[PDB]
Design a protein around this ligand. Sequence first.
Ligand code: MH0
Length: 104
Amino acid sequence: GDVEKGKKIFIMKCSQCHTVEKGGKHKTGPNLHGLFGRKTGQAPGYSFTAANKNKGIIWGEDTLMEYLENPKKYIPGTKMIFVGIKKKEERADLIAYLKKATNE
Ligand code: MH0
């Protein structure tokens, strides 16, 4: 579960829709800008589906694991078009990379 292993998850499955670039840009999906320590569904340019706001718990290390197991069930109302990440090891490298890049 680290950054260098973890970018090889996001760049493969995710970067086709998302970015993690400082100063922000827009794609099929949001820029992840300061994702950790918050709920989303509200930002000046991002997260237009809002079950992301109403889920009662933040993005963190054991909430992204269970979201990424099956997205449309953990957030029952999202534009996240992705079925689920079968491995927990890959989810753990992915979350590690995002904690380095979203806080940067
Ligand atoms: C484009 C079809 C698409 C792919 C592929 C994709 C992969 C991954 N996502 Fe997505 N994603 C959305 C929301 C999230 C989300 C919350 C972001 C926020 O609220 O700012 C997270 C943490 C996340 N996605 C993570 C991953 C990830 C890792 C991968 C690869 C496994 C939304 C919903 C936001 C909105 O309402 O606009 C969209 C549109 C979305 C698209 C895609 N994600």
